[PDB]
Design a protein around this ligand. Structure first.
Ligand SMILES: [Cu+2]
Length: 128
């Protein structure tokens, strides 16, 4: 409903949006991630990861280094505000997070951390 969004990552390393708006009065927000296509998780897995704009580089750098078995996220990374798990084609995962984690006027970015994906699979998240 108003406090959720559906996003897709496909076999061509595309998310289907580059901008998410969250109603600032939502108590929680949910992202429902899915993966059209047929490529398996070990080839074309995707996740959905939220951080500040400033933290994204570091999250991506350490995430890509962390490997498939760690969903390409640094374990215990305090910069990651919220994340789904890593999913392959035909799979689905949802994450819910507390909108009080987020500041009106702050610049947030969502992105996919797997090797080769983050520059191609990113966007803004902003409160309205
Ligand atoms: Cu991806």
């Amino acid at each position: 409903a108003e406090c959720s969004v559906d996003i897709q990552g496909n076999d061509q390393m595309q998310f289907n949006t580059n901008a998410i708006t969250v109603d600032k009065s939502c108590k929680q927000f949910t992202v429902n991630l899915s993966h059209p296509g047929n490529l398996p998780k070990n080839v074309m897995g995707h996740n959905w990861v939220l951080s500040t704009a400033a933290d994204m580089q570091g999250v991506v750098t350490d995430g890509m280094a962390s490997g498939l078995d760690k969903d390409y996220l640094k374990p215990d990374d305090s910069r990651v505000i919220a994340h789904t798990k890593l999913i392959g084609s035909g799979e689905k995962d949802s994450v819910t997070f507390d909108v009080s984690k987020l500041k009106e006027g702050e610049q947030y970015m969502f992105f996919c951390t797997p090797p080769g994906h983050s520059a191609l699979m990113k966007g803004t998240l902003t409160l309205k």
